Write a protein that binds this ligand. Sequence first.
Ligand SMILES: [Mg+2]
Ligand SMILES: [Mg+2]
Lengths: 171, 159, 185, 58, 51, 222
Amino acid sequence: AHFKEYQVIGRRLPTESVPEPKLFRMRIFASNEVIAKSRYWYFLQKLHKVKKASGEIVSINQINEAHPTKVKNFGVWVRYDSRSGTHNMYKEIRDVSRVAAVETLYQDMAARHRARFRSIHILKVAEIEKTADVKRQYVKQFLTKDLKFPLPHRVQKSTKTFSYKRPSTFY
Amino acid sequence: GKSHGYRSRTRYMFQRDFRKHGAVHLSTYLKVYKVGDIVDIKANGSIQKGMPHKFYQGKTGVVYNVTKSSVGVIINKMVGNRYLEKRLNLRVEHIKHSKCRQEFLERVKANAAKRAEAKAQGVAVQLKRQPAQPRESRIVSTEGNVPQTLAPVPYETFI
Amino acid sequence: GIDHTSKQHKRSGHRTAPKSDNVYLKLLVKLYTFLARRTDAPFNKVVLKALFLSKINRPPVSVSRIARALKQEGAANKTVVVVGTVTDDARIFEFPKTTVAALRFTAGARAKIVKAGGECITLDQLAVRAPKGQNTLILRGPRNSREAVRHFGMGPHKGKAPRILSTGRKFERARGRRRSKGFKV
Amino acid sequence: AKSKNHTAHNQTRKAHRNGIKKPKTYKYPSLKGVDPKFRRNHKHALHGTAKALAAAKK
Amino acid sequence: VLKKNPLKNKQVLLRLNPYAKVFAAEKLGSKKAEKTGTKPAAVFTETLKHD
Amino acid sequence: AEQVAAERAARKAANKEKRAIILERNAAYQKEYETAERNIIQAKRDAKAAGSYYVEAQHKLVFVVRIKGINKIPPKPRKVLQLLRLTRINSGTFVKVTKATLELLKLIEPYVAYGYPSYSTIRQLVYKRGFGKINKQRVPLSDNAIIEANLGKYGILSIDDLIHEIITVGPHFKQANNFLWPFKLSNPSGGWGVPRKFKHFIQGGSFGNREEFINKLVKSMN
RNA sequence: AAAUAUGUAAGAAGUCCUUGUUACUUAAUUGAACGUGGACAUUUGAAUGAAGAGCUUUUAGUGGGCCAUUUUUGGUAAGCA
RNA sequence: GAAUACUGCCAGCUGGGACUGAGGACUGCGACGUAAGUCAAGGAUGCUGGCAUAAUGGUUAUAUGCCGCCCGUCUUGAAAC
Ligand SMILES: [Mg+2]
Ligand SMILES: [Mg+2]
């Protein structure tokens, strides 16, 4: 859906042999708290020997964007499962916030590789603080000095089923 | 043709075990059974007399008769759409006491002790067992336990 | 749709409003359904259910059973109640001075009871003497003594009286009944 | 003209229609199969117990 | 003969619950909370803003 | 023997003390509800201020709604649904959260939607669809006399007393819950929100544990 | 050496104390079984639900089946067995 | 130092629309009232117009929209070429 980012902090259940476990923390892009906690336990079952019955979640907090009106370039490292194997990819997206960047990332992977939400693993997402570290041409195109371009062929959708003049596509 | 003998399909069921073959130890002969005891049935392949059938392996029953070297046990067998009563004469090498019964009797005597001691005060004894309740509120601190951030690991061959 | 856990629309299976067309019996069940509705005594409900019963569920009660019930201690002056018929018994020789309320009395039983000094009472006179069943004692005859229940549940190793017309030697005493001829049941 | 040999289809449904009633247990179960030397003494023990109780509450 | 529904029908609402009248009087549905000036710890906010 | 004035006046007076007891009880319940929720909020704030984390208590109550119809159900989940009294689609029941009941909810996960109900949705359920089981009959509540006649042995006098016993899962929760007839809800007024129901709520469907989003669904279906 | 299935138990027909019977048993009032009298009651012994629970008689039709998911046998396979 | 978004609550107010009016003296729970009493409180009443007849309605033929395979039988399966 429209994604939100949460921090989820959890731990193992405390025993007498070891009280105070190590309080692992992860950042999850998810639609809500339930999906966020499910993905948290999914990745902790991939990492450490723990499961939901043997552990607990001590905190979940929404992390909204610090500057939601700054235009950033993000580099995203992704695992995905194809029909024959597992691959790593690095894609970079020029967008205004992290949740919108990963939303366009999920759309981009589903469009160009037919990869689903169950197949995509988000390794990391990070803002590229400096230009000329941008490595893709499709985003390096929009970083030029005095960028301007026209929008040819305007199509205006009509409300009536009949129009009384030939329309114009000037913009 | 088909074959359904008395000990058909009993190969691994009536093997002895690994490294405990041979003669049986004397605790099985020194154990004492009374009428009304609840016993588990597990056949010993080293003793061929007084053997139970393969249906009653792992079955639990009640003693109704005590003879010289054997024990009469009552099992309930599902036949069709009802249970029937089955009486078995088994030598004592093929039975042992059920531990759940003695655990329950220990609960009975400790429970009566609790009721007897708390009857002198009337403090709402609350003698029934309760299952696993949901765990209540707690405060977890980060003093020396600052959270460590984890991320998914990229893919590798590992061969 | 409902996931039904029981059979829908089933009758209760208990007989009410008896199948007989006897008008005096219908008057009696009218009186006792009034009494069972409003006197809040269990005796009236018991005799109301006993009034519905069929003939084999109303076995006769002998005067010997009545006398044996009266020989219970603290029960010498109770009123014996038989929802059904009362037959006599020549196997008993002395009879106490009781009161017996019943549907029907045979001639011998009525003669025995009124000869011993007691009395025979109908159920409506029982109702007007004891509306809540004061000092009563309900007796029932033996249901499992009929000839038909001998053959009920016949099978191997049951000892349960085969349905047979002629008896004696050579009428079912052979192969299947002694081990010299085959097997024994 | 071959036919179906054997199946257990529908059998558990047929059983669980009005099925799997546990047998009725009673106080004082049957003493058949119990050892005759035990029963022969048990008869005399209960006879003496009944005589003692009758003499106590006579 | 007919089920009149509370959460409309204030007559049967007052029939079931007498406290609803003083609830509406005191306006406990919109109750103003008392403000507290507590600030979270620096370790909490840096753990929150940690990448 | 006029018998229409003195007994009527005594009955009216007795109703007046019953009404006064119900009024002060509801005042106490409202006070303890708001102090409890404000104490939880302040405990979270103090844990954040001290640099710790406040792990709140696991919820002791769920509301369970049957979502799948009655055809083609395996026998073990079918028996669990009958034991939880969900014999109809869009039928709901409160369940006390215990390990023994969590295993049942795990068994009938693909046919129910359950979650943690709030005070508002509990109040709306009992007030709108409130039916008691009185000698195997489904009686609408509609008056406190019914509730104090049937649950007055176990201290419950009014509908808000029954609501309090439900939400604070007390000593007589089992008796109050079995007195309550299963709630017959309708289909949701705004729809289910998903194109396809019988996936898990995590998978974008409807069954499973929408742990706190059950209030929106139940308020739409009620 | 799992998972899923599977046996039993979660009391009143129970526990504890005392002492009666016997031709059984013991070196022996030693034990075995059944008992007398006395004490322990609504949290009487986990959860949930109960729609009534239990019992009996009599008789109909049926005794060619087939399909789907999962496990699986023969077969290259089959809308095959 | 604020606002707003998002989510949640109100026993907050209020506008439009549709379907239903079962029951038939009274009894109950309530509310507003000092009281008399009143009320939206255990199921619809008040006011008004037209017509009083084939007008509504029923039946029947036709037209239109959508749907509708031939019955009985054997069979796992029948509209069956
Ligand atoms: Mg399906
Ligand atoms: Mg859909």
